[PDB]
Every structure is written in structure tokens, then in C-alpha cells.
Write a protein that binds this ligand. Structure first.
Ligand code: HEM
Length: 154
């Protein structure tokens, strides 16, 4: 799939707002995923023991990881599709070390879109959400092909 330049602009405009608070968004998104799909929390051996959303908010480690995760995603989106080199180390660790099924990457895409919609309504109307969605479907499609090449899932 190929996004047009206008779709990438809608994506990078709302991302420029997200980057004013990277740790806050990282945190909001991971919690949102864990709440919505609690099975995903089991993949993290470091956070698994968290029991409530209050425990999640208060975990410094979780917040540090939400910064790591978000930065990496930001770096991929700013490539505007040309992300082959970035995708390599990510596909290898998530498919071989962490073992993260594509279905989970669909759950986290839904969590990203929930949070942006909550925090940035004026910059995330229907066309901007369609563009963000296109960009994460592109990322999932490419990661899924990498996964196959690595021997995982398909
Ligand atoms: C948009 C997608 C995502 C991005 C860009 C991403 C990014 C990252 C980055 C950059 C790290 C650290 C380095 C590494 O191990 O490669 C990481 C670690 C990890 N990721 Fe993700 N990830 C994504 C989706 C997920 C999903 C959906 C899950 C689980 C349901 C997951 C599970 C983990 C785990 C288990 C680790 C290790 C955490 C720790 O160090 O203990 N990731 N991920």
C-alpha cells in the first residue's frame, strides 16, 4: 500500500502534537491496551504483576518503556513508508524474543487510535484517522511479511 503525501501530512501533523508529551502518550497507550486486552499484559514479564490501572500509572518502568515504544514508532512513521531498515530489528525481537502475534499488533493499533482520538479531537477528525489507520495497516502488513521471512507465524 502507498499513502499519498496528503495522508502522510495528516499523520505527521497529529504526531507533532503527540511529541509534545511522549511519556504521557506512551503510558496512555500501553495502559489502554492492557485494559482492553488483558491477555497482552502476559507477554511482558516485567509488568505482568501489575493488578490495577492505578498500579500501572504509578509504574516508572512502564512509563520508561512507553517512551521507548513510542519513540521507535515515531521513527518509523517519519520515514513515510521507507522504513525497511527500522523494521528489521523490530520484527526480529518481537517475532523471536517476545513472540507477539499480529493480532496483538492490531490491538495496539486500536489503542493508539483511541488515545489520539481522546487527546487530539481537533487534529484527528475522520480523514486524519483514516490516514493514521492506513499508516498502521502499512506497518502491520510490512511487519507480517518480515515475520514470515523470519520463520514466525506467518
Ligand atoms: C507499534 C508497535 C510496537 C513497537 C514500535 C514496539 C517497540 C518496542 C521497542 C522499541 C522495544 C525495545 C527493544 C526490542 O525489544 O525490540 C520493545 C520491547 C518489547 N515489546 Fe514492543 N513494540 C510494539 C508492539 C508490541 C506489542 C503489541 C507487544 C505485546 C502485546 C510488545 C511487547 C514487547 C515486549 C514484551 C518487549 C520487552 C519489554 C521489556 O523490555 O521487558 N510490543 N517493543
Amino acid at each position: 500500500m502507498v499513502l499519498s503525501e496528503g495522508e502522510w501530512q495528516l499523520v505527521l501533523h497529529v504526531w507533532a502534537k503527540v511529541e509534545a508529551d511522549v511519556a504521557g502518550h506512551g503510558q496512555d497507550i500501553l495502559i489502554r491496551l492492557f485494559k482492553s486486552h488483558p491477555e497482552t499484559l502476559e507477554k511482558f514479564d516485567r509488568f505482568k504483576h501489575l493488578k490495577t490501572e492505578a498500579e500501572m500509572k504509578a509504574s516508572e518502568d512502564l512509563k520508561k518503556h512507553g517512551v521507548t515504544f513510542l519513540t521507535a514508532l515515531g521513527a518509523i512513521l517519519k520515514k513515510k513508508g521507507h522504513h525497511e531498515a527500522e523494521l528489521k530489528p523490530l520484527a526480529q525481537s518481537h517475532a523471536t524474543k517476545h513472540k507477539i502475534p499480529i493480532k496483538y499488533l492490531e490491538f495496539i493499533s486500536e489503542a493508539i487510535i483511541h488515545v489520539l482520538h481522546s487527546r487530539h479531537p481537533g487534529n484527528f477528525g475522520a480523514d486524519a484517522q483514516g490516514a493514521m489507520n492506513k499508516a498502521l495497516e502499512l506497518f502491520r502488513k510490512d511487519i507480517a511479511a518480515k515475520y514470515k521471512e523470519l520463520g514466525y507465524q506467518g
